[PDB]
Design a binder for these strands. Structure first.
Lengths: 77, 54
RNA sequence: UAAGGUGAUAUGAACCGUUAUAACCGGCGAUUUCCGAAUGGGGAAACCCAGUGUGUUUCGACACACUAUCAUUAACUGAAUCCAUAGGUUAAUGAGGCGAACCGGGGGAACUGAAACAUCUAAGUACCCCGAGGAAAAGAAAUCAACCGAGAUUCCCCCAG
RNA sequence: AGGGUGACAGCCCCGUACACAAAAAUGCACAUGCUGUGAGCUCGAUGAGUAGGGCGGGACACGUGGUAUCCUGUCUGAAUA
RNA sequence: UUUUGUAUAAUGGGUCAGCGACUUAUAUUCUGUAGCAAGGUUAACCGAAUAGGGGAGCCGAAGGGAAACCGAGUCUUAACUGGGCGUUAAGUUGCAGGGUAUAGACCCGAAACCCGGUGAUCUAGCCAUGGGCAGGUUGAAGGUUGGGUAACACUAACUGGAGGACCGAACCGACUAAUGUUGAAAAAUUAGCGGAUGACUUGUGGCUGGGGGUGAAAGGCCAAUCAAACCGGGAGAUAGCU
RNA sequence: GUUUAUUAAAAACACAGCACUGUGCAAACACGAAAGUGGACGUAUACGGUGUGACGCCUGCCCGGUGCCGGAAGGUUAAUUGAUGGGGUUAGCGCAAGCGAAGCUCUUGAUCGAAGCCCCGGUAAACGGCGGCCGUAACUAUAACGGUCCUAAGGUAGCGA
RNA sequence: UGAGCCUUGAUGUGUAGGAUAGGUGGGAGGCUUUGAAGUGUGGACGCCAGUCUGCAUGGAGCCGACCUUGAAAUACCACCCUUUAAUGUUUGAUGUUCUAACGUUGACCCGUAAUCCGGGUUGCGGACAGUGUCUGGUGGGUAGUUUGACUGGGGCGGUCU
RNA sequence: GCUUGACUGCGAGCGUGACGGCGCGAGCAGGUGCGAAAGCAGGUCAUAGUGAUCCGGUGGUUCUGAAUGGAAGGGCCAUC
C-alpha cells in the first residue's frame, strides 16, 4: 500500500478544477520513498517506506524516537 | 544541518563546529558512518561538556 | 402436574400407567453422526487421505486422544558474519464466521431539476468496503457573547425558509 | 376482557379480577468480604516539524468571492504566561 | 376516444365476474362554519393524558425609505403649487372544502444512463491432454543406373511419397430450389452442392467479463439477444407524448 | 481458407510478399493505479504499430496546408522568484484642515524562467494534392504548344463509355 | 569563474591659484630617528596631463588661517559616496572527481533440498534516473454534451429587431 | 449677430401596451441665454438610429461597518 509508515499519510481524493470548474475525480499521491536508516541503538539498517515530509520528522525526533512509536502502534520494521 | 563533527573531514570541519550544510550530506555520511553526531538539542549540551572538561 | 398415554396427516398393531419411575411442561446436564468459520492434509459441501500417542485370553485391523492459520507473550535454538540479528520450533492466550435495521470511517455515481446543458442540483443519497457496540459517534472550551455576561456534548420545538 | 360449548351464555367449560407458588438455572438491585486499582495536601511542570504560511483540494448554509474558521496531498516553518 | 368534422372502411373492447385510477403529509391563500377579540394562538414537553399546565414563538393592529433614521405621516429635492407610497375597514386560531408549493403526486408505459453481483456446459479466441479422417488418384525433392558432355547442363527407366493437391463417405460447413410458415423443428426436412492430411475436426478440462472480453473484422459473438449481456438496486428515472 | 449462428459466403476479410516508422533488451509496445506477466525465456536475418496484398513491368511530379523528425541568433510565454509604486491600520506631530514612522496587512508584478508557438531546413510506400481563367491545328469540338493566376506543384507510364 | 554581501586600500583634470580641491565632522599640530624629504629606475593606470608603488641611492624634514577660492589641506583621524582592484562569505550553463542515498531483471553467499522475496559482500552506474507535488504544450485514448426556429412535409434558399 | 435650455429637481393630465416598458405634456422651483419688449428655449419638421437582467469598472455621497474605532465589501446617484 502507498501509506506513509511514520506520519500515517494515506492518499486522498480530489477534483481537477479547471478554468471552467468542471469536476473530475482523481487522487493525491504522497511523495513516498524507500530510505534505509541505520540506528545507533540496535546497530541495524532499518528500511522504511516513508514520505519526503516524514523524513524531516525523523530528523527532529530521531530514528530511535520514531521506531519507538512504531513499536507502540504495532508497526513492523 | 546543525550537525557537529568529530573527525579530520575536509574544509567545513575543525574537530566539531555547528555548520550550515544540506541534509543530504548530513544523513548516511555523517549520521552514522562515524565522524559526527546529530544535533537534536540533546547533543549540543552533552558534547559541550566534552569540550569543556577535556 | 397427572389418569390416561405411545407428535401430526392417520387409523391399526403391541403394550405402558392410574396415587406417583406412563405421558405432558420446565430447569440443569449427557449423547451430540457428516457438512458448514471447519481448524490433521485435501476436496465437485454432506467425501477422500494421513502424522503421533494409547488400548488387544486374536496386540494385523478397529476403537480412543491430538495435530489449521495469524497476532501477542514467554522459553529453547539459530545463518550469511566473531558477538549479534534475520529465521526455525514449542507452549500459553486471543481472533476467524453468521445475523434485519441503527453507528463510525474509507471510496462514491447516474437518471432527474435547471423545461436544453457544462457551474450547480440530484448528493455525500443509492451502492461497495472495513470496524464496533447495545447504542455508536460526539463530549468538559486555544467555544460563544460583546464591555453586560454565559459556561461540555446530544436530541426535540422555535428562531426560519 | 376474551374464547369454546349443536342459534346470541355473568351464573356449562377454559379463563378473567384477585390471592399464591420455584428444587434447579438466570437477569437486575443494594448490604458485605476479598484481590488489583488509585485519594488528599504542598511544590512544580503545561503536550514543535506543531501553530502558521506557499500551493492543490475538500468540508463549514457559505460554488474563491472582499472570505474568516476547519481538514490536509505537497513545500516551508515559529513564539514559549 | 380524439377531432373543424365519424355509421364511418379512424381508435378501444370475445363475453362474464372480481380487481383497477385525482390520495396522503407539511406549508401557504381563499370560501363556509365555530370560538374569542385589539388581540388571537401555543410548538416541544408535563399530565390526575385530547383536559389542565407551558406564551418559547408565530400572525395582526403602522407605515415610508436602499438604509441610517423619521413617523400618521414618510420618501424624493435646496424647497415643492406638489408628487410616489400610506392613514381614515378587525383580525386571529381550529375544522371542512376550493387552489398553489415540495414530495411518485391521477394512473399505465418508455427507448436509455449509473452502480453492485452473476454467467465463456452456447458461441469467439487461446492453453493443456486425447480421439477421428473409408476408399480411389496425381508421382516433387532425394537415392540408384544408363544415355549424353572436355566436365556441367539436359534426358531415360526404377525407387521414393512431397502436397493450406484432386475426386469422394464418416465428420464438418450451409450455396440453389421446393415443402414447411398457428411447422415434426422459436431455421429444420428432401434433393443437388463445398471442404475432407489440414490455417483440419472433435471429446474432456482450464483461462480471458460489461465501456469490458473476444473478433482471418460482420460493429459480429458473449446461454434461443448485443450500436454495449443478464440479474438486483438507485427506480414509482423522466415523459411538454398516446 | 475466414465471415454477418437464425434473409447478404462475396469482388469482402485474411494471405505469403513489399515498404515506412517505432525498437539495443530491464526492448519498443500492451495488459495492468502498482507489483508482475505477456512480448520472450526471443536480441535488429528479431519484435511491434501501420499501410498495401502472390508473381511480371513498375510506382512520376509537388514540402505550401495538416503531422512528424531536427537545427536553433532573436521574439513571446507557466509554476516559481517578489524588484518598485499605491492603499488600509495608527504611535507621534499640528489648538484645526491634514500629513505621517516602524510593525503587520492589502494590492501592483521588473528580473530569473524550459518546452511549445512565431522562424528555418527535411520528410509524401505520412494525411494529402496533381489546377482554375485564356489564346492557338481546315467547320465546330479537342489542345502537341504558349501566357496568366505567387496557391507547394499541374498527370509521367499504363488504362479508359 | 559570473553575481550579491563584509572588511581592507587606491580613487576624484569648473576656474584664479604655493595645485588631476569628494562632502559633511574631530582637528593648531601630527608624522620622521619603531631612520624623513628629494633625486634614479622596474611594473602600471591614463583625458600621455600627471599620479600611485616595490627595490635602491639618499642621511634630517614635510606643514595650517598662511594673501587668494562660492567651499581648505595628502597635518592626521572617523562613518561613508562615486569609480576600481585583491582576499574572504553566499548563490549559479558546461566539464571532472568522490560514494554515502538510490538503481542493479551483474556476480557471489545465507535464511532455504526456493528462478519469489529479504539480508550481506563486491563490481559498475549515481546524486542522475525514477516517483510524488506544482505547472506549460500535446491529447476524441476516454467521458459528459451542444449543434436554433418559423416553413404550404422536411431539407436547400431566404427570414427573425 | 449674440450664445448654450442637447438646463437640474419636479410634473397636473393624457396617449399606447397582457406585461416589462415607451411617447407627449402645459406649468412650478432654482439659476441662465436671446430680444427693447410681449415672450420663447427641458434638442433637431415629425415618425427608425436600439440591448431587459445578472455581473463588475470609474466618480460622488460616513447610508451600512458581523466586539468597538476604521477599513474591505455593498447600496444610493452619475457612468462604462
Amino acid at each position: 500500500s502507498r501509506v506513509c509508515q511514520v506520519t500515517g499519510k494515506r492518499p486522498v481524493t480530489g477534483n481537477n478544477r479547471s478554468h471552467a470548474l468542471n469536476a473530475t475525480k482523481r487522487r493525491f499521491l504522497p511523495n513516498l520513498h524507500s530510505h534505509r536508516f541505520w540506528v545507533e541503538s540496535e546497530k541495524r539498517f532499518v528500511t522504511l517506506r516513508v514520505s519526503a515530509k516524514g523524513m524531516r520528522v525523523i530528523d527532529k525526533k530521531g530514528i530511535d524516537t520514531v521506531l519507538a512509536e512504531l513499536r507502540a502502534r504495532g508497526e513492523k520494521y | 544541518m546543525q550537525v557537529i563533527l568529530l573527525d579530520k573531514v575536509a574544509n567545513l570541519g575543525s574537530l566539531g563546529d555547528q555548520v550550515n550544510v544540506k541534509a543530504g550530506y548530513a544523513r548516511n555520511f555523517l549520521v552514522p558512518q562515524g565522524k559526527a553526531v546529530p544535533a537534536t538539542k540533546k547533543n549540543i549540551e552533552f558534547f559541550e561538556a566534552r569540550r569543556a572538561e577535556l
